[PDB]
Each structure stands twice: as C-alpha cells, then as structure tokens.
Swiss-Prot record:
It is found in: Nucleus; Cytoplasm; Melanosome; Cell membrane. The TPR repeat-binding motif mediates interaction with TPR repeat-containing proteins like the co-chaperone STUB1. The keyword Methyltransferase does not apply. Belongs to the heat shock protein 90 family. The chain holds residues 16 to 224 of 732 of the full protein. The modification N6-acetyllysine is found at residues 43, 69. ISGylated. This is Heat shock protein HSP 90-alpha. Homodimer. Identified in NR3C1/GCR steroid receptor-chaperone complexes formed at least by NR3C1, HSP90AA1 and a variety of proteins containing TPR repeats such as FKBP4, FKBP5, PPID, PPP5C or STIP1. Forms a complex containing HSP90AA1, TSC1 and TSC2; TSC1 is required to recruit TCS2 to the complex. The closed form interacts (via the middle domain and TPR repeat-binding motif) with co-chaperone TSC1 (via C-terminus). Interacts with TOM34. Interacts with TERT; the interaction, together with PTGES3, is required for correct assembly and stabilization of the TERT holoenzyme complex.
Length: 209
C-alpha cells in the first residue's frame, strides 16, 4: 500500500534548482547528510538524559556509511531519533518552505549551493548526486516507514517491510551514473576528513568484498 504525495511547490522548486544548476562542488551532500544524522543523534541523546527507556530501541549512537557498487548506492545510517510518518510527509522534519525561501534569497545575493545547510534544507543536497533517494526511518513513537522520491514533483510513503532498524534513519542514495566516485573508499574518506572532522559520533566507513 503506497501513498503518493505532491511536494509543496517551493520544495519542488528547490529540488529543480539543485538538479539543474551547474555546480561542481557536489561532495558537500555528504557533509549535509552527516550533519543531519548528528542532529538526529543529539535529539535522542537529549531525550535519554531524563528518560533512559528512550534508548531501549538501541543504546549505540553512531553513523555508518555503506557503499555498494553492485547496487550503485551509498547509504548513510544513523541511530538517531528517527522520524514519524507525519515528519516524513512534512518535508522530513524540516521547515523546508521558509528554509527554501531564505536559501533562494541568499543565492541571488551571492551565496552558493554549499551553504544550503545554513537554511535547514541540507537533506535535499542529496539530489546533487542521486537520481533517487530512499529514506527508511523508525521513531520510538511510530512504525517503520519508507519515503522515496526521484524528484519530478512527487514522493511516496509506505510502511517498510524490510529489515527492522530499531531506531534511526537510513538515507539510501541511488547515485547518478556519473557520480560513482562517491562509492570509492579513498574519496569518501577524503570528504569525511575534510568536512566532518568534528562530528561527535563514530562514523564507520564500511568496506566491500
Ligand atoms: C541500526 C542499524 C545499523 C546499520 O548499519 N544497519 C544496516 C546494516 C547494513 C546495511 F546494509 C544496512 C543497514 F541499515 C541496520 O540494519 C541497523
């Protein structure tokens, strides 16, 4: 059972700009997704300070980066607070309407795409490198859901029957054919060292057979 939704017009406009603008510095997508994961991990950590049972769904707070060259996917996994179904539908827990407005007002005034995270919509930088993005998520207060979009103005949400995650979010980037450098170990390591050196959670880069 799959529900299909239209993006708000402003969010479709944001995605089109990310997809269509000539902009070579695409590697910042990974910094933005890792930053989102860190923010989600901070949230569950804070809740656990007054209610330890919030971690019954998983005590480890971490970020995993999982390249798969056979599937042409890069997956960013975190054990953060996760997202409810309502969060997913409401622009993956962001204030994306007002964030997009501010971001586009910054671009025509000199800013570049790399500053997207300062406007709270860094998730959408995934479309710098991905033709399709799948988001699997589990929040303590809801069931496990899968969000998906290839842009084009719509996204889907369905209950996820895949492998249970316990708690957190998995962002699966189905990479564009010409963006496979982001599956190479040395390239991922370089980006993490350059942009994510001060993230306060272990970032484990998985290797492939
Ligand atoms: C809490 C997560 C941690 C993790 O990393 N994984 C995972 C492991 C391998 C893989 F390919 C995809 C994953 F989401 C899980 O399933 C549970």
């Amino acid at each position: 059972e799959v529900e299909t939704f239209a993006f708000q017009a402003e969010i479709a406009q944001l995605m089109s700009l990310i997809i269509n603008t000539f902009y070579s510095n695409k590697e910042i997508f990974l910094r933005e997704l890792i930053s989102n994961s860190s923010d989600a991990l901070d949230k569950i950590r804070y809740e656990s300070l007054t209610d330890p049972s919030k971690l019954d769904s998983g005590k480890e707070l971490h970020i995993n980066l999982i390249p798969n060259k056979q599937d042409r996917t890069l997956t960013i996994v975190d054990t953060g607070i996760g997202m409810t179904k309502a969060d997913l539908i409401n622009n993956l827990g962001t204030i994306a309407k007002s964030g997009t407005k501010a971001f586009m007002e910054a671009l025509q005034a000199g800013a570049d795409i790399s500053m997207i995270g300062q406007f709270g919509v860094g998730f959408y930088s995934a479309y710098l490198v991905a033709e399709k993005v799948t988001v699997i998520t589990k929040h303590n207060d809801d069931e496990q859901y899968a969000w998906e979009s290839s842009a084009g103005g719509s996204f889907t949400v369905r209950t996820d029957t895949g492998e249970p995650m316990g708690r957190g979010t998995k962002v699966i980037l189905h990479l564009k054919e010409d963006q496979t450098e982001y599956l190479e170990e040395r390239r991922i390591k370089e980006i993490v060292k350059k942009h994510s050196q001060f993230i306060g959670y272990p970032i484990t880069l998985f290797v492939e057979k």
